Amino acid sequence: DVSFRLSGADPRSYGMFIKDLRNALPFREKVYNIPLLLPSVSGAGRYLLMHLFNYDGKTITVAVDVTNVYIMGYLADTTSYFFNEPAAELASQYVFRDARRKITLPYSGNYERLQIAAGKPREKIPIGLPALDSAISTLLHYDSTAAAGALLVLIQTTAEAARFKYIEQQIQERAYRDEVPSLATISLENSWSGLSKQIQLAQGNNGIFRTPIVLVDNKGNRVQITNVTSKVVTSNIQLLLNTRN
Ligand SMILES: *[C@@H]1O[C@H](CO)[C@@H](O)[C@H](O)[C@H]1NC(C)=O
Ligand SMILES: Nc1ncnc2[nH]cnc12
Structure with a gap:
């Protein structure tokens, strides 16, 4: 527990x-x-x-x-x-x-x-x-x-x-004051399954996503994630949903 x-x-x-x-x-x-x-x-x-x-x-x-x-x-x-x-x-x-x-x-x-x-x-x-x-x-x-x-x-x-270090950090920022979620928070929440799938497929594709995933970054801008050297893969995501699910 x-x-x-x-x-x-x-x-x-x-x-x-x-x-x-x-x-x-x-x-x-x-x-x-x-x-x-x-x-x-x-x-x-x-x-x-x-x-x-x-x-x-x-x-x-x-x-x-x-x-x-x-x-x-x-x-x-x-x-x-x-x-x-x-x-x-x-x-x-x-x-x-x-x-x-x-x-x-x-x-x-x-x-x-x-x-x-x-x-x-x-x-x-x-x-x-x-x-x-x-x-x-x-x-x-x-x-x-x-x-x-x-x-x-x-x-x-x-x-x-x-699931996401960024979202952990956003809640730490809100330890004593609530605030509506950032644009990136919503984007990551919506993308966990997709990111999980692409990171698992990348293992047989030299780290390259078969299908790039669009996210909103920490500055509120749209970004395309294409490969495992992205900070969303190296730092942010913490758990992968198995592709069998
Ligand atoms: C791979 O991802 C990195 C980090 O986001 C990026 O700088 C680079 O342009 C990407 N490579 C390709 C070929 O898309
Ligand atoms: N019940 C739930 N538990 C965890 N993540 C969710 N995302 C949407 N609904 C959820």
Whole structure:
């Protein structure tokens, strides 16, 4: 399991938590020195438990699929909550079994459905460590509309920060003041699968992407990524989604 406490958190402690979340995910090999997530994990071992504590010390436990860093559901006190989708229904066979009841949220866990339920796109929702405190608070007691926005904050401050060093650094900048995500943050979040695929294909193509990937950089400009010497490959991406998924 991994844990993070908002009480006493600072950029260093968050950075160390994200390093620890990455290290909790299994891999058999690295590609261009980036861990390659596994194609598949059978049964309960597929799920990592992430214990999150708000400023006031109240907690939720979040279930994360270790093959794709996808948040499936969470436990708050005696109630489990799962996204309305088959992978999350499967997870509910393995995690939080001792909850007194299980609620299926009235949306899947993809960005498209969460943004419709929240009534706002990611671009308009401030993120940061205060926002994560608020999100844990919101998720402690059921509210499906408020929960959708809380889950967008939770996903971006945990899973997306694990996937990209840049996004970790953006949340560190927001340790004490929330701010809507940068243009590059949205671009990277949207591109993880594509980048993963191209970096794995590059291993048999002399480091060259078979299909260049368009990103927004840290200055807000559009750039074309063509090969593994790009800083997005050498410094930024931290985990690769296996091409088998
Ligand atoms: C490979 O990527 C590097 C770093 O972004 C870039 O400078 C270079 O132009 C790329 N090479 C080709 C042939 O696209
Ligand atoms: N539920 C989720 N978990 C992790 N990353 C996601 N990206 C969009 N939805 C996600």
